[PDB]
Design a protein around this ligand. Structure first.
Ligand SMILES: OC[C@H]1O[C@H](O)[C@H](O)[C@@H](O)[C@@H]1O
Ligand SMILES: OC[C@H]1O[C@H](O)[C@H](O)[C@@H](O)[C@@H]1O
Ligand SMILES: OC[C@H]1O[C@H](O)[C@H](O)[C@@H](O)[C@@H]1O
Ligand SMILES: OC[C@H]1O[C@](O)(CO)[C@@H](O)[C@@H]1O
Ligand SMILES: OC[C@H]1O[C@](O)(CO)[C@@H](O)[C@@H]1O
Ligand SMILES: OC[C@H]1O[C@](O)(CO)[C@@H](O)[C@@H]1O
Ligand SMILES: [Cu+2]
Ligand SMILES: [Cu+2]
Ligand SMILES: [Cu+2]
Ligand SMILES: [Cu+2]
Ligand SMILES: [Cu+2]
Ligand SMILES: [Cu+2]
Lengths: 333, 333, 333
């Protein structure tokens, strides 16, 4: 395979490594490295801990971006400091269980997989060792996404280019943290030690936490997402195990690929869209008003009570034509 | 803003205030009033009670109907007879959390919000005070919908008008009523008193009841929906918090906007469609056969056992070409 | 009704009786017989038993295949060896609750229903006796599907024929098996005896098992699905009560009708699709790589832990352009 090679420096979510939308480049071999890290993390503002397993140290794993017809060459590394075997499966790839059947590595090993990016869209990647370990590694955090762009960039299905000013990757994670008799969340010394209680809970299908970027409140405060009035923002949303229903509170999905695949035209003007468990989708919005927005799953219990809220802070001029407070709160006459 | 003003007299669901589909009117300021009512109601045929919170006294709140480019001016009233602050957020509107950030009112206050109807479709509106109160006010009943019609009326995406003879609004409500030790549903003296037990249940994500129009059996008997053979009926369906899968038993969705937005063409000939939690959708059907139909969510446990069944009673002539009982029940030969 | 009659010999899922895609035949009366069987079956590899109720002895019931404008004439038989009344409702049919209101039969009776196939697609059929019996009979196994093909066969929405080399029918069943105090699954002597415990569990909305073709591992081993590289395979997927999110691990949905209705163009290049509870959908894929694939619902807990995994074994030549292991597992340098 005699094509040019290009290295990518991955960046942690919700940011996305620099890339072209439309490109004059032809196919390349695009090189990525992912290093697995098992670690105990804090997932809420109460201090609840969680035995996480991650690609590159983050939940979600970083977004990889390539173009149709590129070859994606990933070096997957499982350092000896980890305890379990791992692998990687790309929903964008064809054959061998998405790559999982060619990438099983013990602690202390690495492997190099290449796949051709023949399908456009956003796609999940995740670990999938085998059997009951599959769901457990996924819901422990071992999932991310890849975006395969058309070489002409995105379009609206009517001949017009859609160009985003910025892209964010929101990875949503369903987490299953057991409770003790008195009702407090349990802590564990290792992923192995967490397994029996965690599996019992998993099979009841109700998460204790549903978070963006790994933690309640991760995408708030200093880490709110940002935009300006006038900017077109692409929001890639993934969920490797469980459905979600994204919604931008105060905005819309101007152009939405809820099934996430760019061979299909986007839908327009949505209020709420739907990410099937095991998939990524994408929505574009051009901001029209300044201020705070919340980006949620619109099961509001999950959003407000289980963790699944991000914020945007948007700068610019208020548009009184679009919305105005005609009369401020006052006593009823 | 120097446009003509038009008042609307809202009507209780499942009915919809009179309106034009295609119109020669230009943009107007369309005036609506919503008066919040907290009240204890009965939600099933066993006499289970529920601490409801409502717009205009109903679950769902009434359907508001306007046209693209209208300005919607709502007077939201929170009488002093209520106990909590409330607001309103319109998924159809742009900015300020859908209006919620401009409409927070204490008991004894009112506020007037105006928003421009720049997106066509059916959309949820709901209360969203802040934080954990958001899901609680929604699942207590504080949600409804608005329909923003194209000025040329609805179309099939192929150049042909779709005109409905009648429209119904089915609002679906997931309710969380705790049980006591012996397993009976609990009753509470106030919404505040219901809150701790109700929140604990909410976060487990399983409703005790799933109802249309506020109560088991609301849209049955004297209050069945009606049609005649030959009539094209639009059914708007909303669910502000939780997914639903509508189905007309014995019929179809001839033209369905499951994501609910008229900038997208309808899908045709569906058996079951999908309303994402946090959205409204719409389906049109031209009745071909007389008799009873059930309109359900097609999780049949929720439909038959938790409350989510409506009926249509349809008049007209039976069509033996479409369906016939060739041989009535008889002993096996 | 003076049309030619054609008998079909139904076959057990996941196979599908022989049929034409595009046809030069005009409308016919196509004759099917379904014989209800209540029986206790084993549903997992641990030996858990289940009080099943079936059409033709299988879960799902067999796939019926006809063309648009055919008349489907079904003889439904409820032998005296059964204990309960049953009926049949076709989501493909118009009127009388899909046929249910014309087909209620006691043990020892049969009935003959005819309906005109005016809507194209794949559709659920199921028993629906009335009231709380509706969900119980469905989740006990009394559901299958029918496929109504265009007379010109399937198309891609752009003027091109899609022709499948083979079709499989995957029926997914949510099952509710109660547990005793110590946590073992219960066994029952009759469906009637299982009813009280089973209904209590049903209304909590969480299945104990989610299976394809009636049992954990049914579509594995000797009974794996098969294909060759180059073959275009149609996979019809139904779920009469509960949502599913199909995914072909290592493949894609090349052409997908997730709402299942052929009057709509397929979506292309999907990773995961969505079957609404109460519906059937269909996906086509042309295999490009040999080896084992898993076909799952991509709630991986349900797939790996509750039963919902099938396999394909695919013959042919590996394509190193599409995917290759560049470097086998090795020690990290
Ligand atoms: O981007 C995928 C397709 O989108 C649209 C364009 O008409 C087509 O040329 C392009 O191939
Ligand atoms: O109604 C939204 C659109 O629907 C279609 C029509 O071709 C277009 O003119 C219209 O603007
Ligand atoms: O198959 C349904 C329809 O699909 C497409 C074709 O353009 C149309 O002629 C056909 O009727
Ligand atoms: O945006 C993608 C869509 O746009 C088109 O290329 C042009 O309408 C379609 O063929 C494709 O499905
Ligand atoms: O029905 C709405 C749809 O109809 C069209 O106007 C004409 O095909 C499309 O542009 C739009 O998406
Ligand atoms: O595949 C079905 C689709 O294909 C067409 O016939 C041609 O584009 C559409 O009218 C229909 O929705
Ligand atoms: Cu792993
Ligand atoms: Cu996967
Ligand atoms: Cu409120
Ligand atoms: Cu909302
Ligand atoms: Cu039955
Ligand atoms: Cu049904």
């Amino acid at each position: 395979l005699k094509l040019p090679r290009q290295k990518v420096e991955l960046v942690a979510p919700p940011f996305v490594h620099a890339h072209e939308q439309a490109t004059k480049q032809g196919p390349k071999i695009v090189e990525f490295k992912l290093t697995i890290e098992e670690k105990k993390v804090v997932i809420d503002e109460k201090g609840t801990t969680f035995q996480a397993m991650t690609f590159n140290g983050s939940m979600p794993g970083p977004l990889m971006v390539v173009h149709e017809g590129d070859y994606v060459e990933t070096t997957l590394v499982n350092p000896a400091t980890n305890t379990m075997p791992h692998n990687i499966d790309f929903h964008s790839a064809t054959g061998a269980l998405g790559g999982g059947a060619l990438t099983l590595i013990n602690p202390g090993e690495q492997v190099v997989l290449r796949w051709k990016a023949t399908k456009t869209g956003v796609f999940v990647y995740h670990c999938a060792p085998g059997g009951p370990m599959i769901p457990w590694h996924v819901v422990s955090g071992m999932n991310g996404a890849v975006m395969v762009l058309p070489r002409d960039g995105l379009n609206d299905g009517k001949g017009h280019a859609l160009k985003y000013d910025k892209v964010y990757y929101v990875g949503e994670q369903d987490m299953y943290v057991p409770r003790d008799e008195k009702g407090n969340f349990k802590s564990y010394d290792s992923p192995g030690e967490a397994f029996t209680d965690t599996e019992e809970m998993m099979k009841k299908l109700i998460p204790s936490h549903v978070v963006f970027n790994g933690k309640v409140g991760a995408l708030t405060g200093k880490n709110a997402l940002t935009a300006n009035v006038g900017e077109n923002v692409l929001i890639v949303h993934s969920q490797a195990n469980r459905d979600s229903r994204p919604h931008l509170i105060g905005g819309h999905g101007d152009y939405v690929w809820e099934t996430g695949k760019f061979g299909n035209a986007p839908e327009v003007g949505l209020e709420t869209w739907f990410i099937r468990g095991g998939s990524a989708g994408a929505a574009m919005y051009k901001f029209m008003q300044p201020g705070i927005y919340a980006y949620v799953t619109h099961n509001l219990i999950e959003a407000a009570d289980l963790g699944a809220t991000a914020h945007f802070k948007v700068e610019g001029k208020w548009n009184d034509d679009l919305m105005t407070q005609v009369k401020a709160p006052a006593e009823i006459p």
